[PDB]
Design a protein around this ligand. Structure first.
Ligand SMILES: N[C@@H](CCC(=O)O)C(=O)O
Ligand SMILES: N[C@@H](CCC(=O)O)C(=O)O
Ligand code: NA
Ligand code: NA
Ligand code: NA
Ligand code: NA
Ligand code: NA
Ligand code: NA
Ligand code: NA
Ligand code: NA
Ligand code: NA
Ligand code: NA
Ligand SMILES: [Zn+2]
Length: 866
C-alpha cells in the first residue's frame, strides 16, 4: 500500500454540488442510489475518478444515459468523456451485516448506523471521498417499519411515506454543504429522550437523544451536558447552533469515542450512558467532555472543514482545546490542566519518540485512520493553547472571529487558521508555524544566576529537539516560556528590566538566549514553564527545598502539583536504579514530610491535594527513562505507595474519614472531596493488611455510587487484599449483563499485579460478558493488558507479546482500526532492553507475514522494523 503526501495536494478536477441518496435498507443487502450534480474544473480530457471500496456496481448513468466510457480499478471507478456539467447516477449494493470493520454502513446490535470519517463514505457509494468536495445532501431511507421504525439522517425531515409489504420511508435534507465524512444514517428501534434548547438570539432547537430500549434511565446527564455545551459555546465563543434539531444516537459498537456528523452525532454509548450506580465521577466528566467536543465541532470542523486529511489538527487540535476550556470553565481548571499535562508527558511524549512520530500536520500518511493520534489531538491542542498564551483571550477571540468570517462554508488549512490569528492580533506567528511541521518533543534547558551586587537574575535558556525517525533535521521553535519569581516569603517579585515591566511569558526563539531581570531584591525561587506553557521537557537543576517551597507557596495550583512531580521524579529514578541492583526503596524523610504537609494543609483545595497524592502512572514514570524497565517501574510504584502508606498512616486515615460524604452529587466540590478521599484509600490499602482489608471491603459494600465502589475494588486488586476474589465475584454476579460496567472489571483484571494475570486474561476471552466483536470489550481486556500493564505485557518470557500477536492475527481481518490501536505497545520496542527488543521484533516480523495484512498494521509494522 502506497503513501500519500501533503505536498501532493491539488484541487479536484471535478466538484459535486448536490447529491440525492436513496437507501433501500436491509442488513444483508442494501441498495444505494446516488444522484450527484457535478461540475468539471480541470482539463476537458480529465476523467472523473471516484473512490469506492467493496461496492457491487449495478449501473452508471450520465444525464440519464447508460454510460459506456468507464472502468473499475482498485479502489476506484474512472468515468471518461464527460460534459462540463452533468448529473451522475450510480446504483450499487453493499452488505451491512458483513461489515465487521465498522467503517461505512454497518450493524450495531439490531440497529444500522454509519461511520464515514475519514474515508468511510466510499464504502457506501462511489464518490469524491475527500473533504474539500462539499455538497448539499438529500437522503431518502426505505426500510422495514417493524425492524426500523426510526430512520434518521442529517438535517430535517422533508418527506415521509408508507409502502406496501410493511416498509416505510423518510427523506431528510441538510441545507449546509458538507464533505461526505460528515454524512450519517441510523435505522433502528430506540427509546428517545427529548428536550429543547433556546439559543441566545431565540432559535428553538429540538434535542433528541436515541438510546437502546431500556436505557432512558441513563440518558439525562448527556442531555444536560449537551445543553451546557450549547450555553458555553455561546458565552465563551459567541457561537450558536445553526439548525432546528440536534440528534445524538448512542451505539454499542463503535471504533472511536464519538462523531460530529452534522445534526446527527453518533456516539459510543460509553460516552453517553451514565447513572450513579453504573458510572464513576470520571465517566460523568468524560461524557461531559465528549458531548462538548462533538458539539464544538459544529463550528470547528463542520461550518469550517478541512481541505485535506493532513489538516486534521485544524479541527481536532482546536476542538480539543475547546473541550478542555469547557471542562476547565465549568469544573476545576487546575485539575483539568494537571490531567491534560499527565496525558501529554506520559502518553504523547512516548508517541513523539516512537517510530510513528509525526508533526501535528503530518507530511506522509499510508492509512489516515492511523493519524487520529495523541499528537494530532493533544499536542494539537497544546499548540492552539500556545497561540492563546501568546495572544491573550481578547486577541485569540478576534482571531477566531476572523477565521470564521473568512472561512465559513469552506474547507480550510492549518495555515489559514494561523494566518487569521496573526492578522487579527498583529502578533507575528511566522516562526510559530514551525510547530505544525516539526515532530518530536523539545528539551528546554535552563540555568540561572543571581547577582547580589546588581540585584539581577539571569536565565540562560537553551532548546533542542532530538532527531526523530521521520525527520533528521530539527530547528528551534517559538516557545512561550512562562515564569514567576518568588521571594523568601513566597511573594511574587515583579518582573522588570531597565525600569519597565517585562511580560512573564518569555519568547524563547533561539537555540540559546539569556534573559536578565533587574530589581530582583531577593535571590528567587523560580516557577518555570508555568501551566505547562509549552509542550516541552524542562531540564533545570532543582534543589529539593526549592520544590517543597513551590509546593507550599506557588500561586497557581498547577505549579504546586508540578513541583511535586519534579520532587518525585528524582526519587523514582533513584529507586528504579536501586531495584535493578536488588536494593529496597530509599526516600529522604523531608520528601515524606512534604506530602504529609499537603495532607494536613487546611487551605489547599482538596482537588489539588488529591492530584498531588495521586502518584504518576507507570506510563508517566516510563517517560523519565531512556531505556524502560517496566518491571522495576511497577515494583517501585508499589514500594513507594507502601512507604508513604506506612509513613503517613494516621494522617491518611484522618483525611479519609474527614472527607466522608453521605449524599452523592455530581458537583465539583463533592467530586474533589471524593477524589481526595479515594486517593487516601489507595495508600491505606497498601498499609497494614487487616485495616486495609476492613476499610476496602466496607467501602465496597456500603458505597452508594460506582465511584466509591470501584475505588475500593480497584484497591483490593492493586494491593492483592484477602477480600479481592470475593468482591470481584460479587461485581461479576451483579453486573455481567451490562457491558459498560463490565469494562471496568475487565480493566482491573487486565491491570492486576498478580503473577498469573496473563492466564486470567486469556481465560476472560471466554467470559460471558466478553466478545471479540465489540471494540469496547477488546479495549477493556486486551488493550488494558498490553497498554496499561507493561510489567506483564513485558514479562521476560515473552508471553505478553505472543498473546498480543494472536489477538492481532484475529483483529487484522476482523477490525483493522482496532488492531492498529492495539499494536501500539509493540511498536515501542526501541525503548526496551536488547532481549525484549529481540522478542518484540520477532512478534512484529510474524505479523508482517500475515496473509491479507491490513494497510493499517502495515504502516506501523514497517516503521517499527526500520
Ligand atoms: N472526528 C471525531 C472522531 C472520528 C474518527 O476517529 O474517525 C472526533 O474527534 O470527535
Ligand atoms: N497500584 C498501586 C501501586 C502499584 C503499581 O502501581 O505498580 C497504586 O495504584 O496505588
Ligand atoms: Na462542491
Ligand atoms: Na441534494
Ligand atoms: Na472552573
Ligand atoms: Na482502511
Ligand atoms: Na508573520
Ligand atoms: Na544557578
Ligand atoms: Na538554581
Ligand atoms: Na515536573
Ligand atoms: Na499509588
Ligand atoms: Na463471551
Ligand atoms: Zn474531534
Amino acid at each position: 500500500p502506497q503513501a500519500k503526501y501533503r505536498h501532493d495536494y491539488r484541487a479536484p478536477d471535478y466538484q459535486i454540488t448536490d447529491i440525492d441518496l436513496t437507501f433501500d435498507l436491509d442488513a444483508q443487502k442494501t441498495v444505494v442510489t446516488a444522484v450527484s450534480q457535478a461540475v468539471r474544473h480541470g482539463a476537458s480530457d480529465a476523467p472523473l475518478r471516484l473512490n469506492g471500496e467493496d461496492l457491487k456496481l449495478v449501473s452508471v448513468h450520465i444525464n440519464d444515459e447508460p454510460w459506456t466510457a468507464w472502468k473499475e480499478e482498485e479502489g476506484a471507478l474512472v468515468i471518461s468523456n464527460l460534459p462540463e456539467r452533468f448529473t451522475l447516477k450510480i446504483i450499487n449494493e453493499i452488505s451491512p451485516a458483513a461489515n465487521t470493520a465498522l467503517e461505512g454502513l454497518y450493524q450495531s446490535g439490531d440497529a444500522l448506523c454509519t461511520q464515514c470519517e475519514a474515508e468511510g463514505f466510499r464504502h457506501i457509494t462511489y464518490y469524491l471521498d475527500r473533504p474539500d468536495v462539499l455538497a448539499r445532501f438529500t437522503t431518502k431511507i426505505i426500510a422495514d417499519k417493524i425492524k426500523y421504525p426510526f430512520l434518521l439522517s442529517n438535517g430535517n425531515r422533508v418527506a415521509q411515506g408508507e409502502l406496501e409489504n410493511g416498509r416505510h420511508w423518510v427523506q431528510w435534507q441538510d441545507p449546509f454543504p458538507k464533505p461526505c465524512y460528515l454524512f450519517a444514517l441510523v435505522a433502528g428501534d430506540f427509546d428517545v429522550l427529548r428536550d429543547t434548547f433556546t439559543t441566545r438570539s431565540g432559535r428553538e432547537v429540538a434535542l433528541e437523544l436515541y438510546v437502546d430500549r431500556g436505557n432512558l434511565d441513563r440518558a439525562p446527564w448527556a442531555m444536560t451536558s449537551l445543553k451546557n455545551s450549547m450555553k458555553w459555546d455561546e458565552e465563551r465563543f459567541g457561537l450558536e447552533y445553526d439548525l432546528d434539531i440536534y440528534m445524538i444516537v448512542a451505539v454499542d459498537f463503535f471504533n472511536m469515542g464519538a462523531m460530529e456528523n452534522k445534526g446527527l452525532n453518533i456516539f459510543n454509548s460509553k460516552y453517553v450512558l451514565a447513572r450513579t450506580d453504573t458510572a464513576t465521577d470520571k465517566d460523568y466528566l468524560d461524557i461531559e467532555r465528549v458531548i462538548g467536543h462533538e458539539y464544538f465541532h459544529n463550528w470547528t470542523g463542520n461550518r469550517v472543514t478541512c481541505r485535506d486529511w493532513f489538516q486534521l489538527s485544524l479541527k481536532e487540535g482546536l476542538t480539543v482545546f475547546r473541550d478542555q476550556e469547557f471542562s476547565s470553565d465549568l469544573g476545576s481548571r487546575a485539575v483539568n490542566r494537571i490531567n491534560n499535562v499527565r496525558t501529554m508527558r506520559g502518553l504523547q511524549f512516548a508517541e513523539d519518540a516512537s517510530p510513528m512520530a509525526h508533526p501535528i500536520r503530518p507530511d506522509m500518511v499510508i492509512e489516515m485512520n492511523n493519524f487520529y493520534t495523541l499528537t494530532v489531538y493533544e499536542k494539537g491542542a497544546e499548540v492552539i493553547r500556545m497561540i492563546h498564551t501568546l495572544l491573550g483571550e481578547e486577541n485569540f477571540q478576534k482571531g477566531m472571529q476572523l477565521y470564521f468570517e473568512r472561512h465559513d462554508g469552506s474547507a480550510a488549512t492549518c495555515d489559514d487558521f494561523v494566518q487569521a490569528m496573526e492578522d487579527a492580533s498583529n502578533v507575528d506567528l511566522s516562526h510559530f508555524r514551525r510547530w505544525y511541521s516539526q515532530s518530536g518533543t523539545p528539551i528546554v534547558t535552563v540555568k540561572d544566576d543571581y547577582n547580589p551586587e546588581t540585584e539581577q537574575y539571569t536565565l540562560t535558556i537553551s532548546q533542542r529537539t532530538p532527531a526523530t525517525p521521520d525527520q533528521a533535521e530539527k530547528q528551534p521553535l517559538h516557545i512561550p516560556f512562562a515564569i514567576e519569581l518568588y521571594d523568601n516569603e513566597g511573594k511574587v517579585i515583579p518582573l522588570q528590566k531597565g525600569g519597565h515591566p517585562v511580560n512573564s511569558v518569555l519568547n524563547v526563539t533561539q537555540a540559546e538566549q539569556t534573559f536578565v531581570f533587574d530589581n530582583v531584591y531577593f535571590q528567587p525561587v523560580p516557577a518555570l514553564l508555568c501551566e505547562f506553557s509549552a509542550p516541552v521537557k524542562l531540564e533545570y537543576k532543582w534543589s529539593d527545598q526549592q520544590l517543597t517551597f513551590l509546593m507550599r507557596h506557588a500561586r497557581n495550583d498547577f505549579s504546586r502539583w508540578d513541583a511535586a512531580q519534579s520532587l518525585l521524579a528524582t526519587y523514582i529514578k533513584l529507586n528504579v536504579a536501586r531495584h535493578q541492583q536488588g536494593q529496597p526503596l530509599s526516600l529522604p524523610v523531608h520528601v515524606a514530610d512534604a506530602f504529609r504537609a499537603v495532607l494536613l494543609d487546611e487551605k489547599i483545595d482538596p482537588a489539588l491535594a488529591a492530584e498531588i497524592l495521586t502518584l504518576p502512572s507507570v506510563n508517566e514514570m516510563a517517560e523519565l527513562f531512556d531505556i524502560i524497565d517496566p518491571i522495576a517501574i511497577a515494583e517501585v510504584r508499589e514500594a513507594l505507595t507502601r512507604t508513604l502508606a506506612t509513613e503517613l498512616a494516621d494522617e491518611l486515615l484522618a483525611i479519609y474519614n474527614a472527607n466522608y460524604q453521605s449524599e452523592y452529587r455530581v458537583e465539583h466540590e463533592d467530586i474533589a472531596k471524593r477524589t481526595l478521599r479515594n486517593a487516601c484509600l489507595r495508600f491505606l490499602a497498601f498499609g497494614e493488611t487487616h485495616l486495609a482489608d476492613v476499610l476496602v471491603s466496607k467501602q465496597f459494600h456500603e458505597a452508594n455510587n460506582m465511584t466509591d465502589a470501584l475505588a475500593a475494588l480497584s484497591a483490593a486488586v492493586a494491593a492483592q487484599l484477602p477480600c479481592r476474589d470475593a468482591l470481584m465475584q460479587e461485581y461479576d454476579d451483579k453486573w455481567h449483563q451490562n457491558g459498560l460496567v463490565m469494562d471496568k472489571w475487565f480493566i482491573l483484571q487486565a491491570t492486576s499485579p498478580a503473577a498469573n494475570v496473563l492466564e486470567t486474561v486469556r481465560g476472560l476471552l471466554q467470559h460471558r460478558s466478553f466478545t471479540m466483536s465489540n471494540p469496547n470489550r477488546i479495549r477493556s481486556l486486551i488493550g488494558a493488558f498490553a497498554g496499561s500493564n507493561p510489567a506483564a505485557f513485558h514479562a521476560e518470557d515473552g508471553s505478553g507479546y505472543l498473546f498480543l500477536v494472536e489477538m492481532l492475527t484475529d483483529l487484522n481481518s476482523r477490525n483493522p482500526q482496532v488492531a492498529s490501536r492495539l499494536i501500539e505497545p509493540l511498536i515501542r520496542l526501541k525503548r526496551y532492553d536488547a532481549k525484549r527488543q529481540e522478542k518484540m521484533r520477532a512478534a512484529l516480523e510474524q505479523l508482517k507475514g500475515l496473509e491479507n495484512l491490513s494497510g493499517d498494521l502495515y504502516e506501523k509494522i514497517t516503521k517499527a522494523l526500520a
